[PDB]
Amino acid sequence: REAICIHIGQAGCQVGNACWELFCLEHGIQPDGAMPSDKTIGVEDDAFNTFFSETGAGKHVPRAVFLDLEPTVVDEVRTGTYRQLFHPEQLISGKEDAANNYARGHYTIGKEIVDLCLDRIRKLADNCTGLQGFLVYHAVGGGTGSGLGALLLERLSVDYGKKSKLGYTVYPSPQVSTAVVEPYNSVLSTHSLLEHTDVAAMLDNEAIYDLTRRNLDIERPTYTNLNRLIGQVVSSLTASLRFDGALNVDLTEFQTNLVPYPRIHFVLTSYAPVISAEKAYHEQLSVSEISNAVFEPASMMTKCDPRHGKYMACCLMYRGDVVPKDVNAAVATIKTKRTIQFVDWSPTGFKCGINYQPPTVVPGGDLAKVQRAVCMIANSTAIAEVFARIDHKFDLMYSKRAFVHWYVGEGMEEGEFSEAREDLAALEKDYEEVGAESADMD
């Protein structure tokens, strides 16, 4: 029943703003924290409970924390439209940023703020009766997202136990870039995140910009569009807990079906009916068409091509007016294709889910209104190319000690670079060996 959302840093807080806007409009909680006038104790109305808790006066408040080291974005939330929705204690802000240094966030600044975060999460977890996981939003490219996200996941992993941790992560784009030190922060973040996360979903802004240019008709997209797409995907994955359906899927089922070996937990995500209102009137949107859509790499929110690898498992979530025979026919048609390949040790490659609630439409949005949608998260060996491309840039920079004095000055041993680089080399070797056919292995 309950799930707690943790939002970290700039991308994570802005995506949180889009997500809670969506969850409010889908359940019907007004921006001032009030159920509409037509809802009473006359009928059973509890679906919000997965994301909201009600006070004794009947106000709703959401099960989320927003974490930042700079005040500006949380002060924008405090001064924005949803001022009365959030409890003021939930919006925690420090004085100064981690300045793109993972070392500054982890060692110098996040250690001061971390105890307040664990106390707030504990205060939320005490007001629950069926918590079944944490959802985490952060970027690994920036200093506070990497450092405080790693430190907080480590502390949560020590305090709590046998609880799932699912991450939605914005990785550094392969040629679009925002900072020079992106490789160092991404390597050290992935090194800490490898041991303490059950499934990690990867997003790339360059891919979602391509998707908003290609599918929608937006010439000059901005982060609010990207954040609305991310909000739709998270709403689709968590819809299985909140509404009636033929085949529900608990968050623990994702880790069981998608992860074959404990280190192999990085998955691709895609969403099918990304379409504009003018295109929506030229096309029917049947189950088989959107099922065919989720497998094209042009539909993915991470810049990787799955044709350079092999799939090990796929999880397909259908929501809306769908009938099981059409889901079975669609999955059977995909399996026939020769350019889609699965490793020979994974014969039963699919997990299915079917939910009746269609996706909600947001007043200023750019997506059309549709009766059905499908969302996919999948595990594939193609991910080794993303790490290989980050590692080449790391090797280029570390060969000349390009920026190390900053990291050593803020408190970190230089040895940590070599340890993380060796762990990523071993992860590359795991992805090389796992893709080897069994017939050649004898």
Binding site: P297, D305, T336, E432, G435, A436, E437, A439, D440, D442
Partner: protein, 173 residues
């Protein structure tokens, strides 16, 4: 209650037990790593290993602003069904009996390839080798696999399209 039952079904049980149990032995470490014996001849992400029986992708900048992505194809697979399963259709499916490749019996009923345009869509240069889609596993008139091969321990072996190795060199005086 199981005396005569086990006595009468003895020899077949021992035969199947002697066959299956060697296969159940683990060949991979608990970390997902191969044992010291029977190493693979080549690494997995090599061009000829990854695309042994599948065309490699083609990338182009058309339609994209940033790093391009490939596209799916409609190439179907062989019309093979599990042994002893009813002809199941949940709805109208696209059977693979049709879309039979045009390389079937090409060298017998026709004159074979008579132009270099086969390199545009049928012959690929994958890494240090050559892939040809017309020289794979043999199929019958109804797009069904003819031959099935097994290792010493009894694992099905997939087909290969790799025909030859190209000795590439840079030029000099």
């Amino acid at each position: 209650p199981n005396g005569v039952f086990h006595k009468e079904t003895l020899d077949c049980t021992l035969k199947n037990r002697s066959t299956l149990l060697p296969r159940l032995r683990a060949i991979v470490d608990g970390r997902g790593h191969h044992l010291s014996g029977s190493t693979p001849p080549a690494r997995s992400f090599h061009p000829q290993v990854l695309y042994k029986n599948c065309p490699p992708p083609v990338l182009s900048q058309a339609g994209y602003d940033f790093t391009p992505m490939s596209h799916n194809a409609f190439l179907l697979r062989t019309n093979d069904h599990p042994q002893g399963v009813r002809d199941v259709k949940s709805d109208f499916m696209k059977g693979s009996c049709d879309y039979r490749p045009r390389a079937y019996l090409r060298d017998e009923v026709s004159g074979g390839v008579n132009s270099r345009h086969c390199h545009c869509a049928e012959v690929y240069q994958v890494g240090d080798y050559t892939m040809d889609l017309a020289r794979g596993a043999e199929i019958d008139h109804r797009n069904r696999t003819v031959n099935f091969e097994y290792t010493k321990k009894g694992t099905l072996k997939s087909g290969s399209n790799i025909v030859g190795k190209r000795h590439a060199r840079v030029p000099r005086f």
